[PDB]
Design a protein around this ligand. Structure first.
Ligand SMILES: *O[C@H]1[C@@H](O)[C@@H](CO)O[C@@H](OC)[C@@H]1O[C@@H]1O[C@@H](C)[C@H](O)[C@@H](O)[C@H]1O
Lengths: 209, 203
């Protein structure tokens, strides 16, 4: 078990991450760093030893069944995902912590919301995609609730989020509601209601078919 | 010290794939080797290991009886035969080296190779338009396999652009949206190489 799930820090701050193992056997614990699109890079081995090439700002230690990885002072390349790992002699299998993400702290920013009706193009093709855009918001946590003629939608939508923007460090999210065309054609009001920290009360964008 | 993987590919369920990971820079026969997979949006997941001398293997529950790990020390290559592939096996598979000063850790890794398992067939996408501060975009829908690229005005427009990660729909087809906020003309240039689909879409 790793935690916290996310660590919002600024560059120059100290990052402390936790990992609870099966045993306290110091020697069976390791830490990895992984950035999007790249293979894992070993940081710490044997719970307290720094691997080849890993800078001094990375440190580790174990207290009982809780291993801590410390980043004395976060540099810009340190914002990635960290996993702890474990494996002993026999049986040989390795187990991985589920990961902790070191995120760039920024000021709160409410998302500007946009709702997009299915285009006439796709409707002539047989489907209907209703899209909900939540632009440049912070922090990451945001809840989108889809609405059709007042009916709460569940299980018919999918969303995806962008990586933290390199210039402003915010997030953008897109939620697509899939309805069959005839279904779409028999209801009137479509709305994405958004809940976010920067919003004092929920905001909903909507349109009439 | 190096490891190069190969063998990843788009496959239908029930088919087989063989992954390779050739090693250079330390002598292969001295260390044990493993395969670690990483599903899309998930964490590192251990798969299997093979002993230094190649005689004792071990597997994760989810692949036993189906994948078999092995190695040819002579030609410094580790292998992962993957049979009876299922849709939930799709992930990036990395081969990894047991550490030299502690081999309970993995000190080196291959660059990884993609294994995609789907009962879907190659298909080009339909690009539909999404229409003081305005937002517009292009919905790149129903394509397979990954990936697709999206640019605006042939690479000239770049500020305010957010191209979202593809999402796998129930149909087994991918779908992705690409937006741009503006405070003229807008064209999303979409390229789906697996199917030779180049589509410019003026919004
Ligand atoms: O190191 C091996 C040795 O200890 C023998 C005899 O005690 O036991 C083996 O496990 C039964 C040990 O190898 C283990 O499995 C192999 C596949 C790994 O490469 C090793 O790191 C170890 O986990």
């Amino acid at each position: 078990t790793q935690s916290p799930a996310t660590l919002s820090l600024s560059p120059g701050e100290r990052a402390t991450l936790s990992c609870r193992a099966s045993q306290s056997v110091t020697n069976y614990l390791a830490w990895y760093q992984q950035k999007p699109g790249q293979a894992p890079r070993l940081l710490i081995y044997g719970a307290s030893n720094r691997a080849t090439g890993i800078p001094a700002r990375f440190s580790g230690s174990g207290s009982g069944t809780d291993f801590t990885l410390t980043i004395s002072s976060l540099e810009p390349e340190d914002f990635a995902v960290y996993y702890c790992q474990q494996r002993d002699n026999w049986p040989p299998d390795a187990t991985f912590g589920q990961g902790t993400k070191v995120e760039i702290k920024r000021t709160v920013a409410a998302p500007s919301v946009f709702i997009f009706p299915p285009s006439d193009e796709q409707l002539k093709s047989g489907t209907a995609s209703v899209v909900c855009l939540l632009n440049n918001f912070y922090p990451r946590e945001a809840k989108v609730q889809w609405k059709v003629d007042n009916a709460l939608q569940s299980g018919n939508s999918q969303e995806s989020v962008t990586e933290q923007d390199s210039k402003d460090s915010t997030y953008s999210l897109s939620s697509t509601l899939t309805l069959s065309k005839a279904d779409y054609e028999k209801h009137k009001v479509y709305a994405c209601e958004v809940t976010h920290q920067g919003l004092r009360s929920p905001v909903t964008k909507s349109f009439n078919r | 010290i190096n490891l190069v993987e190969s063998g990843g590919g788009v496959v239908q369920p029930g088919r087989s794939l063989r992954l390779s990971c050739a090693a250079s820079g330390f002598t292969f026969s001295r260390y044990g080797m493993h395969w670690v997979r990483q599903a899309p949006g998930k964490g590192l997941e251990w798969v299997a290991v093979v002993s230094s001398d190649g005689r004792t293997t071990y597997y994760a529950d989810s692949v036993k009886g189906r994948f078999t790990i092995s190695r040819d020390n002579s030609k410094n290559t580790l292998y992962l035969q993957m049979n009876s592939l299922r849709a939930e096996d799709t992930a990036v598979f990395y081969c990894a080296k047991e550490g030299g000063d502690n081999k309970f850790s993995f000190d080196y890794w291959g660059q990884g190779t993609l294994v995609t398992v789907s009962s879907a067939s190659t298909k080009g996408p339909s690009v539909f338009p999404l229409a003081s501060t305005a937002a517009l975009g292009c919905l790149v829908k129903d394509y397979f396999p990954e990936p697709v690229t999206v640019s605006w005005n042939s690479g000239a427009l770049t500020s305010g652009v957010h191209t979202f990660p593809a999402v796998l729909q129930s149909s087994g087809l991918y779908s992705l949206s690409s937006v741009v906020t503006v405070p003229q003309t807008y064209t999303c240039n979409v390229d789906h190489k697996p199917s030779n689909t180049k589509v410019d879409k003026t919004v």
